């Protein structure tokens, strides 16, 4: 999914092609897995813009998980939060980035 600073567009993405058009934190990670596991890769943006939630009515995964479960996608290198119900259908690796809910407030003003 196009998220800063994980997957971003180039200023000259029209001057680039394919995987070159994309940039960010997860984009450099995609090079390192290819350096580790030896494969060519295709960075694809998710169509619906969803992270891969589950429906409650159809119980159909949308998003990246629906691209992973239904054979549309080969792998995901993306800010995907590891939950219980997501591991029920696919397999995460170990987490590369621990995080949590944080408090954004204003900075103390210089007046």
């Amino acid at each position: 999914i196009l998220e800063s600073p994980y997957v971003m567009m180039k200023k000259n993405h029209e001057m680039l092609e394919g995987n070159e058009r994309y940039e960010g934190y997860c984009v450099d990670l995609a090079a390192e897995i290819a350096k580790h596991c030896g494969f060519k890769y295709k960075l694809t943006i998710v169509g619906d813009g969803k992270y891969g939630a589950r429906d409650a009515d159809t119980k159909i995964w949308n998003g990246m998980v629906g691209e992973l479960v239904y054979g549309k996608a080969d792998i995901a290198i993306a800010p995907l939060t590891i939950t219980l119900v997501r591991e029920e259908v696919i397999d995460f690796s170990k987490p590369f980035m621990s995080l949590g809910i944080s408090i954004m407030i204003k900075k103390p003003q210089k007046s």
Partner: protein
């Protein structure tokens, strides 16, 4: 009392402060796992925060994340926002950089590489995560994509001085009256070098000016006797907008309209207002006593200074009762704002325009006095 309470206030760090305070609001996105987290959490701090946010009117829940960015920025620190810490790093790097991340994480969540279940790639990719995290190349890219991409500093976050002392800029508004009093005095010294150098019209022409300043002192007395509007009384509700333009006695409201609304509550304040009318009338009457004795000087210009010495008594006793009367009304007008003036309170609370004028009536009563005792020296 200022500098202590200013230093007594601690910035909030933990979310337990948000369960403790209520002045700074706080919210999450209107849909997502983060809002779901407080909805689900059983910890009493997180439950109380969710109890607040479900009772938060107006709604702290924003629709986009950038809406939560701007709503913190526009509310000026009295609205907080809860978001993902790695994104909270990056937005703090993005300019204007007027927000910041405080405290630790509220929970533990992890981004991890996902494969379809049963794929052959899943195991060496999982080993690749434990390789790159071991070598810190992820942290090197975290330094890249948050701090080599960060607009506001990489280490400049630690450049904000923590609890330092009183600023020089606190003492800069008195510098312009310091230097400005010096340059105004240099005009006085150079002209008095020419007043020593260029040299019945002395005692008479200054005494007629003392009569002339009392004539202006009479007119600004009558000017604030009916103020055009004492305050722009604003109750601009985004109901609808309200613009009271209330005089000193008649409370006009404004399409054009005017009413009296004289003599509000309370009764002890009424006896102050009945005493306020006394100091208004004794101000103007002792002017007229001061006019009549100076018209005897006009007959002396056609006793003398002995009655002008008696005339200087009542003109000072005029203006001092005006200094009573100027303090009778505005203290009461401060008292009426403490009542919450029944439907006509100002939010542009600002004295208007004849009260600055009847100020100058008093100094015309006293500038008449300083020159009529100058003629008393002879």
């Amino acid at each position: 009392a200022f500098l202590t309470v200013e230093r007594m206030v601690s910035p909030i760090e933990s979310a337990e402060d948000l369960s403790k305070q209520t002045e700074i609001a706080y919210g999450t996105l209107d849909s997502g796992s983060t809002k779901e987290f407080f909805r689900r959490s059983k910890i009493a701090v997180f439950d109380k925060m969710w109890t607040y946010m479900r009772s938060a009117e107006p709604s702290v829940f924003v629709r986009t994340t950038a809406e939560g960015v701007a709503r913190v920025r526009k509310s000026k620190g009295k609205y907080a926002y809860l978001l993902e810490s790695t994104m909270n790093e990056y937005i703090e790097q993005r300019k204007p950089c007027d927000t910041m991340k405080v405290g630790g994480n509220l929970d533990s969540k992890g981004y991890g590489i996902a494969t379809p279940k049963g794929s052959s790639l899943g195991t060496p990719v999982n080993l690749a995560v434990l390789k790159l995290s071991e070598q810190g190349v992820l942290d090197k890219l975290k330094n890249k994509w948050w701090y080599d991409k960060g607009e506001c500093g990489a280490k400049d976050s630690g450049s904000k001085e923590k609890t330092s002392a009183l600023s020089l800029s606190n003492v800069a508004g008195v510098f312009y009256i310091l230097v400005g009093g010096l340059g105004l005095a240099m005009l006085v010294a150079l002209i008095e070098f020419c007043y020593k150098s260029r040299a019945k019209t002395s005692r008479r022409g200054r005494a007629l000016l003392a009569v002339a300043l009392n004539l202006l002192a009479l007119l600004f007395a009558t000017t604030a006797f009916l103020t055009t509007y004492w305050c722009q009384g604003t109750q601009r509700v985004p109901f609808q907008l309200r613009r009271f333009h209330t005089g000193i006695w008649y409370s006009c409201e404004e399409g054009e309209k005017c009413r009296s609304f004289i003599d509000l509550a309370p009764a002890s304040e009424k006896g102050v207002l009945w005493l306020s009318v006394v100091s208004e009338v004794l101000y103007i009457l002792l002017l007229v006593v001061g006019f009549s004795l100076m018209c005897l000087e006009l007959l002396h210009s056609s006793d003398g200074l002995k009655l002008n010495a008696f005339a200087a008594v009542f003109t000072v006793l005029s203006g001092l009762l005006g200094m009573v009367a100027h303090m009778m009304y505005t203290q009461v007008f401060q008292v009426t704002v403490s009542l919450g003036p029944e439907d006509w309170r100002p939010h542009s609370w600002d004295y208007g325009w004849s009260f600055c004028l009847a100020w100058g009536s008093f100094t015309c009563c006293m500038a008449a006095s300083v020159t009529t005792l100058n003629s008393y020296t002879k």
